[PDB]
Amino acid sequence: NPEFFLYDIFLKFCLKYIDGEICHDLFLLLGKYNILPYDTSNDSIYACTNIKHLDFINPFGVAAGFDKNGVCIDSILKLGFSFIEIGTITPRGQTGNAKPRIFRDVESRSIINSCGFNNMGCDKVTENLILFRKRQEEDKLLSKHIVGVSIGKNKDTVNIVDDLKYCINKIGRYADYIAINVSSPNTPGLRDNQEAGKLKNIILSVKEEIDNLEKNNFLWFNTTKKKPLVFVKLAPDLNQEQKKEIADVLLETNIDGMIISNTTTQINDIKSFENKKGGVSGAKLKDISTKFICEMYNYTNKQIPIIASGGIFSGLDALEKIEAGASVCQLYSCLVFNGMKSAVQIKRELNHLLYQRGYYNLKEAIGRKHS
Ligand SMILES: Cc1cc2nc3c(=O)[nH]c(=O)nc-3n(C[C@H](O)[C@H](O)[C@H](O)COP(=O)(O)O)c2cc1C
Ligand SMILES: Cc1nc(Nc2ccc(C(F)(F)F)cc2)c2c(C)noc2n1
Ligand SMILES: O=C(O)c1cc(=O)[nH]c(=O)[nH]1
Structure with a gap:
């Protein structure tokens, strides 16, 4: 169904004549009314993966900044993805940096963006996630699908931890994992928070807040039914030190x-x-x-x-990343240039490779470049 030749003509058209952010908001609106194609495929038990108790039905998810507001969770997951990271959310909503702020180069399959954490704010997005979690109770098809939440700071916030704590206290309960965003290049000067001393305090504060959700306040209205796991998203623009x-x-x-x-x-x-x-x-x-x-x-x-x-x-x-040390992969630019066929196709290419490379399962491929 997501491999119907009609979608590929529409995307190739969108890529040539329509502004990137308009295409994206249009495709999100399509998903909002459940008009997008479904994935019928039963994923390979050999391509399954995990991070602690997080049980991924397949190794492919949607990276943060796709469904920033969690308005299109059901539809995006149904394209064939095991998980999605919503946000990055900030306590107060933001319109972001000036438009046009998303540009593509089809020849190089590359994108540039200066969004500046545009989102409805923690509180509206939490309302959007609560609705999905209530839908997940009724729909057995989404029972095993994972939802992460990327958290950041508002542009003018002096102390990042205040904003991270706010987000945890509102949305923590409904997340399977929390991704700390200290790597956006579009919020001055968020990347400074990657310095070791600052990062340590950020991690310990985030973890202390999640741990306190239990004591302060059934409680886990997520997939795992456990307290959310804590991830950190890093920038590639760092030295070895x-x-x-x-x-x-x-x-x-x-x-x-x-x-x-x-x-x-x-x-x-x-x-x-x-x-x-x-x-x-x-x-x-x-x-x-x-x-x-x-x-x-x-x-x-x-x-x-x-x-x-x-x-x-x-x-x-995907195999290159796995053999490098990754357990799961996240896609963004792929959905932009390949379109709706992304998940169904990438899951296939990988399964073929896992057989070809003589691996019993994906779990055996993790970090195999390193002896
Ligand atoms: C328009 C756009 C918005 C993004 N917004 C976010 C965001 O809110 N949070 C985040 O962690 N990453 C964000 N990203 C980064 C992606 O999650 C991903 O890390 C990045 O695009 C690299 O992967 P890719 O080459 O598969 O696109 C954004 C990327 C793009 C293109
Ligand atoms: C043509 C195009 N598509 C974009 N977004 C987008 C593509 C596919 C899907 C879908 F898989 F259908 F769900 C959702 C969103 C962007 C973005 C982001 N920037 O330029 C784009 N240009
Ligand atoms: O909102 C943004 O512009 C954004 C966030 C992020 O983490 N990464 C990115 O490239 N853009």
């Missing part, structure tokens, strides 16, 4: 996983993006991103589970 210092902090603070990685500000060779501001995603991010997984997988001594992002388009791309 920084990556090591962060790795030590992750080991000490016992983070449940790491999202490697967010967009990059280090790409200079996209000609269409020369007059543009923000972070680059897509095919051009793949090598930078996979190298960062190897680095961190080794810096953390294989102790911290990895969530791969991005530059993932093919099964070969």
Whole structure:
């Protein structure tokens, strides 16, 4: 169904003549009224994966910033994804940086964005997630599907921890995991929070808040029925010293996983993006991103589970990430250039590769580039 030739003509048209953010908001509106195609495929028991008690039905999810407001959870998951990370949300809603702020280069399969955490705010998005969680009770088809929540700060917030605590206290209960966003290049100066000392306090404060949801306040209205796991999303634009210092902090603070990685500000060779501001995603991010997984997988001594992002388009791309050290993959740019067929196709390419490469299951491929 998501491989119907009609959708591919519509996307190729959208990519040529319609503004990126308009395409995205149109496709979200289509999902809001459940008019998008479904995935009928029964996923391979050999391509299943996990991060602690998080049981992924397949290794593919949707990266944060796709359904920022959690208005399209049901539809996006039904395209063939095991999970979705909603947000990044901020306590108060934001309209973001000036439009147009999303640009594409189809030849390089790359995207640049300067969104600036546009969202309805923690409270409205929590209302949107509560509605999905009530739908999930009635619909057995969504019973095993996972929902993460990416949390950040409002532009003008001096102390990030205040905003992270606010979000946990409102939406924590309905999340399977929380992703701490300290890596957006579009909120000055969010990336400073990746310094080891600041990151340690952020992790411990977030964890202390989740742990306190029990004491302060049935309680877990999520998939897992457990307190949410804590992940951290990191930027690829860091030196080796920084990556090591962060790795030590992750080991000490016992983070449940790491999202490697967010967009990059280090790409200079996209000609269409020369007059543009923000972070680059897509095919051009793949090598930078996979190298960062190897680095961190080794810096953390294989102790911290990895969530791969991005530059993932093919099964070969996904296998590369897995063998580098990732347990699950997240897609964003793939849905933009490949469209609705993304999940169904990538799941197939990977299954074929797992057989071809002589792996019994995906779990055996994790970190296999490292002896
Ligand atoms: C328009 C746009 C908005 C994004 N918004 C977010 C966000 O709110 N939070 C976040 O953690 N990442 C955000 N990202 C980053 C993606 O989640 C992903 O990490 C990145 O695009 C790299 O993966 P890709 O090459 O598969 O696109 C955004 C990316 C794009 C293109
Ligand atoms: C053509 C196009 N599509 C975009 N978004 C988008 C694509 C597919 C789906 C769907 F899989 F149908 F759910 C949802 C959203 C973006 C974005 C983001 N930026 O430029 C785009 N340009
Ligand atoms: O809102 C944004 O612009 C955004 C957030 C994020 O974490 N990454 C990105 O590239 N954009």
